[PDB]
Design a protein around this nucleic acid. Sequence first.
RNA 1: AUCGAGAGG
Lengths: 264, 133, 102, 160, 196, 86, 43, 559, 65, 49, 114, 139
Amino acid sequence: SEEGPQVKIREASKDNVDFILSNVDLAMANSLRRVMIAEIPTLAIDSVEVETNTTVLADEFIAHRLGLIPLQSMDIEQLEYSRDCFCEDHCDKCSVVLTLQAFGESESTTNVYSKDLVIVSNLMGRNIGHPIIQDKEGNGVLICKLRKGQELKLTCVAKKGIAKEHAKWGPAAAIEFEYDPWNKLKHTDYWYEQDSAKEWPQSKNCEYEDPPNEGDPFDYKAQADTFYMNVESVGSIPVDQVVVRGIDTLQKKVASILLALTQM
Amino acid sequence: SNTLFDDIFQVSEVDPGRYNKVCRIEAASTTQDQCKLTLDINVELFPVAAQDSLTVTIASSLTRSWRPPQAGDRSLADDYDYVMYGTAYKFEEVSKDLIAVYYSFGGLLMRLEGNYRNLNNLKQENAYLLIRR
Amino acid sequence: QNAQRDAVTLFCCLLRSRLATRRVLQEYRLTKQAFDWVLSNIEAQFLRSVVHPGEMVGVLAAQSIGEPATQMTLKKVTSGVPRLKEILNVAKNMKTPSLTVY
Amino acid sequence: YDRKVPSPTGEYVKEPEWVLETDGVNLSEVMTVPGIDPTRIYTNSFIDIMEVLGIEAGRAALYKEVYNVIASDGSYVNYRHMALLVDVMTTQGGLTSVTRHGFNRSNTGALMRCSFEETVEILFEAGASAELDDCRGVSENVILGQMAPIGTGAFDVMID
Amino acid sequence: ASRHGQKGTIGITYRREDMPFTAEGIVPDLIINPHAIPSRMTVAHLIECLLSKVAALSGNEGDASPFTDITVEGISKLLREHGYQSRGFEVMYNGHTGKKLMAQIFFGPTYYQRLRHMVDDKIHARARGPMQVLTRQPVEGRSRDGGLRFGEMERDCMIAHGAASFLKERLMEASDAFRVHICGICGLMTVIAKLN
Amino acid sequence: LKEKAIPKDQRATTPYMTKYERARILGTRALQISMNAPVFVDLEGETDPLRIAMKELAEKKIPLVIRRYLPDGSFEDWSVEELIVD
Amino acid sequence: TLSHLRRTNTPIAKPRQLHNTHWGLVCPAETPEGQACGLVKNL
Amino acid sequence: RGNLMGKRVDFSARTVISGDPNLELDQVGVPKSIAKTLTYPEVVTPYNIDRLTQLVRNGPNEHPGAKYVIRDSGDRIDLRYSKRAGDIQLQYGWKVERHIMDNDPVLFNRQPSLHKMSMMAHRVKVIPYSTFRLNLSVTSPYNADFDGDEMNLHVPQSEETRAELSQLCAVPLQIVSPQSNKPCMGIVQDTLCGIRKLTLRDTFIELDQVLNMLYWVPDWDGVIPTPAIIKPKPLWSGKQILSVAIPNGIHLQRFDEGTTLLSPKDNGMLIIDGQIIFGVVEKKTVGSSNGGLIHVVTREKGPQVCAKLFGNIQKVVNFWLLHNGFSTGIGDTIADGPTMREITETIAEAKKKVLDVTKEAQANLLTAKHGMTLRESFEDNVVRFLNEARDKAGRLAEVNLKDLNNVKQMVMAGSKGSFINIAQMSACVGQQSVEGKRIAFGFVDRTLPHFSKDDYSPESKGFVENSYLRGLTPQEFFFHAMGGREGLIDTAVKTAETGYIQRRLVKALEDIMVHYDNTTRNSLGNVIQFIYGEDGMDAAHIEKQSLDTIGGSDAAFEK
Amino acid sequence: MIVPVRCFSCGKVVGDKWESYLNLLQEDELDEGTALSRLGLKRYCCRRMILTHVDLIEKFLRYNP
Amino acid sequence: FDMGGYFIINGSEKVLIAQERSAGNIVQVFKKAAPSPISHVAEIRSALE
Amino acid sequence: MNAPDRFELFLLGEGESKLKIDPDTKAPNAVVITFEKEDHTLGNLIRAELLNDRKVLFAAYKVEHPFFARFKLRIQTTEGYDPKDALKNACNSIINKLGALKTNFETEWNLQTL
Amino acid sequence: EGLVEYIDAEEEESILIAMQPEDLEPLDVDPAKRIRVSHHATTFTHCEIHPSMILGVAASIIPFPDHNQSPRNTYQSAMGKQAMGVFLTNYNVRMDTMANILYYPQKPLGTTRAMEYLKFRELPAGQNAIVAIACYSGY
RNA sequence: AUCGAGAGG
Ligand SMILES: Nc1ncnc2c1ncn2[C@@H]1O[C@H](COP(=O)(O)CP(=O)(O)OP(=O)(O)O)[C@@H](O)[C@H]1O
Ligand SMILES: [Mg+2]
Ligand SMILES: [Zn+2]
Ligand SMILES: [Zn+2]
Ligand SMILES: [Zn+2]
């Protein structure tokens, strides 16, 4: 297709994507996964006011719990950072307000799942704030447990942020990364007990590259060209957009330098 | 700024002295029975087989920052397939009308022993090395 | 002046031995300009090496013995800190007296 | 014992010799014995050597033992430091030890003496004999918070 | 600390993207220096990473009870059954660059204990604060926002340097300086003081 | 008791300035410099009183003399400009 | 909490060293280090 | 002893310490809240006042600020709450108690203070965390470890006082130590482990790594070195780029027991004028040693270049080690199966020796050695018999450890390790000792109630055949713990006894200073020595050098 | 004292899986290893978040107020 | 999970540390000091149960 | 307590320009750029793409402290080649490769059926 | 029923104890196992319940203390009394002067068999952190 | 403020 880096997708799913980068300089592959982890923005709870807390847990405990809750950030580009808006504290174009209240009416253990979050903000028709639920029963994240006679009443303001400021805005869980399966460019020196090949197992990516010939010498001038990556997303952003918005966030960082140079 | 030495050597001994990408080489000048040579060789770049014959050269040139090949516009000063740069740290007077020279190519060591090159290989930083097929 | 000659006697022995006439010309190959500089350096560098009046050499000495003793922690004789406690608290009742006879 | 000795050619060579290691010490009557060299006999009891061979011979005996504990651990200390300590014990004609009654009974100022041990009693007898402390010691000026004659404080500063 | 005398404070917090990573994307929660191992010979710490690594993968408990016939070889047979290198080594990549690490890293889970010593409970600073009444010196302890002890041991060290004015400064201006009057006939502090 | 000094001839103490009189000199200068005393070198933009005294010392324009007392009570005055600095 | 309840104090002839007779009765290692080590033992 | 010769002081601080590889040697990492709390009186002047008005304007809330202003009248102005904190007219002669700021002299100390090297001046470097950052290679003189240790800090209050720190007590000045006439600070434990890995002849560096490695040196002159390897690929040895940190005019000569000018094992060290010729760098070259690199640079170039030298080596080698990486696993303790079979053979071979010599003593056929009991002679043999088994098993393992073994690599560079640790970890921990002897019969004629009486076997008396890798038996564990307890008592005793010894020496020689003529005297003036050290030198400016006249034949002398 | 939301190392959310994890052990009579594998915790850093977890909250609920 | 074994004085939980003493009413023999005039001693510490 | 606010890792402070530029002393056509509020994401990609240019002589970056998010980048190029232009070609080459990557991924993703 | 006795330190001297019940019984052997000294006694009166009981409560927590140096086990036993964890379930009710509770404690992946009677799995004092041994930076 | 304990390196 287009000249430059190539992508051949091995596998894909709702929250997993497995693909092969081709004709890419290594620094781009690393710089991609760094921004893909901790600079692609996403909305998650960054403020909490607790009316009543009769639970075992402390409020700040419950507050930290709410921070790591997966909230939808598909249309997060249409939302704005609270520090950027002109509101007094938080407007409806920068903040999404959630409410949560549950009482132990049942004469048994009453849980507080993530589905019990209720949105009290004008959404303005964007796919924002809906808490992610992959739980089969639809409950989602188990936040807290309640006895009889216990209740919890709090309000959650969900703002927009970057995972560098706090890991709760993390859009992706874990990116798999292996570029040389046979170590044919000798970038790592193997630790061996009897035989390096017999102790260390074959990587799964070894099936997708050419086995070396020890009779041939070491290709000195060769460089890393083909990369094997697998991205996993928690759900706040679908997998395709995790990498894509990660690519785009990289461009926006580069252009700011290009723009700043024009200013000088 | 021309060549300081030229000869052909046949290797007598090659050993991996507790190294994996470097061997120590032991050769003597062919068509000569009083001049021999020791040198450290990066085997991974140039595999040196036993009982091989290799053309060897030394130049005074061909300070200032080393720049990359630059599209090869600057033509190489070598039709050879192996090159190194170092410094002579001492010249040894084995006997009268006999001499041996010690070279260090960034830790890779060389010992060239002979007689004839008396008016050559002065105490100077520049020491290039060539090896042909 | 004799205290001066006594205080430098060992160093001059090193000086004459290394700056011997056969050694300078056959081993060092020193030229007149080079030789005078070596003479220049030695005089100053020696004069720099002389101790400075006012230095509290005792407290330095006491500490200089103190730190290694603190590191001391572990053919049968009194050794280490117990022996050191003897030497300082001069011990009539030496735990391990011995006489080396030649 | 191993030993290096001058060979007739001049270089040193290993010249082994038999040596008698002892348990127990009475030096006065073992050096006056035939078949031994009374110029090389030695004790690890420097206090006997001080009694028999004079105080200055005990000095080198004192150093060699102090040296032995350091080098047995493998450590190195320069000669001047141990020798300073040694000569301090030796200079008073005897083996003035580093303890509350060994050295701390000198003619030094009482404030200098009262800071180590037996504090109150030193000042008592100092008030009894009415000794005049010259405040030339460091501890006297540390007590008084004055610039002690220490390096920077060893001299005065004046103008043209 | 771990359960084997492996004390140690945090020197830096690195973000996950700065942290080195395995091929499976797993990242370390914590990094210990390898030099702490040889001198202290805490081999049980080394074995704990091995057994705990197999326990998480296997979904079974790890039996580190003493005086058992539990061998590192038997564990390594299990771990290599689960695809990882038998001796706990794992290929790791640099986080800053993505270039492979020349040294394969010993990687695994290990029980670690957050110890009772936090820093902000120990931080203490003072500049001319409260003073005791009798000594006229600064009060003792950080709890009362007191002063640090410039002890005799430290006084010796300043003498070794020769810093005479500093030694006086710590001993006069830093604490309990005072002005007294003395009579020239009887050199005692019994002068009638009518200063103004 | 009085005038127990020694003239410049028959001065026996070290001509080289010890680090202990230097640090006292540099500190004593930087102290009075800190209190708006005159500066006698054309400073090259340096504003640290200690940095002044160091460069003010290299030009030897410091009107101070070192009274080096001796254990008998005698003493030798040594001018800073004649004192050596290595 | 458990370790404080199984604790032993010994006032003030080589007590601090782990004794042979301590086999099975006292923990060989659980004892506060530094000052007054070995006098204080845990069962 | 506690309120006059030592006392509480103002302008002091204390905080948990940790080390920064990207920090200079003479600096100190001071937290902001410490910098906010500590203050230095700086009298106003025409060239500082433009800085001071802004400092007062900042206020003590945020740094660089100030907390107080002292008018000429005498009354103190408090900036935390005052009506005139916003508008101030700084008259000349006024004092401003400004915040502690960057590159100021402070006294950095760690108790216990047995050293001048334990209270050294430092350059203030305000940092955004509440830990005392210090350079990684200033551990040894303080004996600081980042396992929880805390340190102290003091702040001068006058110009002369500031000078004494920078001109007498500075870290660069104490780099050479009068104690042991050698340096006290060296490259330790990562730079040391890495500089050996870096300097290997097998270690080669590609261009991209070199340019970053080259830039990391702060004093790089922009001179790209001509690569050691050319046309097949432009490569650099670790020796190549590492020599860029070494200043010109440095000359190093060292041969060690296997060393020609050719050095087939790359032993020894040859360095010519800011470039190294051959030899792996290790602790002898770059540690606190007599003929070490630090001793040379401090002597010729000076303390400043030597103080800068530390950081330049650190920043390069920490960088290369960061991207090369280093670890230590548990597979590094395992030896060959065939090696293990030889190990247990070596143990059982010494076991039969013990049994046989025991039989010799049982039949009263043992010749009594002179001066000792037959039993003492019996114990003496078996102690030596088992130590040889422990030592032979360790060297039988140390031979088996390949070059890649990371435990061996730390030993080979001398970073942290010894041969004995290898023996105990892999082959056999050895024989326990209580009070100089084997484990005694605490129980009646037996060490433990699982042995029959009058058992003098290796196991019964406290020999541990197994290794830490192999694992100790129940009895071995109690014996091993029995030996360990004495080590803890000995450690508590040695620390306690030595602290007394040090104080006694200090209070005895506290008045001894070299007077203006080199007469070593006390307060009264009693001549300890007539020349300090009998030559009048300072121990720092002193190096061990050979006098070739002493040795050698009378014939070789003549020629 | 309650099921952590996400793994500290991966960051993958794990709070939804605790209730399901327990039902797999008791209702299905499974073992712990296959339970974590059924839930999708394929990396061991995630596994030790739930396998090692001790749900102390049930003890806290027993207190009456 | 509280195991007990403590007292509650002024609301602060106090523990009695087990105290160690050499047993009473048993006979022991001690080799006394070489400079001591007596060379041996047999001690029993007598106290009623 | 003393820790900085965690937004300082990307938010430019008061008067802190994103790029500061300074000439290298004792070096021809050599300049160093003080990137602010940036980590190894930018430095490594600029440097490794600069190295692909054949008219550039030197390119390397360093984080003088992992505390602060900032790094220094120095470049040296041929005479008649301002490093600003060498920087710009690398950046534009990066964005073109990234934009080419984005389109190829979307093509392969939309092809993929799940 | 007379199947277990209470042995004093003094009564210990008159008896013979067996370490393992495999010591009362009548080549190919695993090389990796520890070297058990073959028992050389027959007059056994008692057998040890399990040698693990020589250690206290805190030393029981240490995993593989047999494979560790003796001082280290002493050090840890002092630090486990400083390790933050849930000290009691009624921590919210009591009003202790100081209390420190871990957010998400977890049982260790390597457990002594003696832990179950200390309720350590039920009341842990640390977390199974993912630990790497490496020199990444110089921190 | 006196004494007391447990802990830090
Ligand atoms: N030759 C050596 N040089 C420097 N450190 C060494 C060393 N040998 C061992 N070490 C390290 O120093 C440590 C000593 O610490 P410990 O034995 O636990 C008591 P400490 O922490 O040193 O207290 P202390 O500093 O007051 O003496 C050893 O554990 C080891 O890691
Ligand atoms: Mg420490
Ligand atoms: Zn808004
Ligand atoms: Zn009067
Ligand atoms: Zn995870």
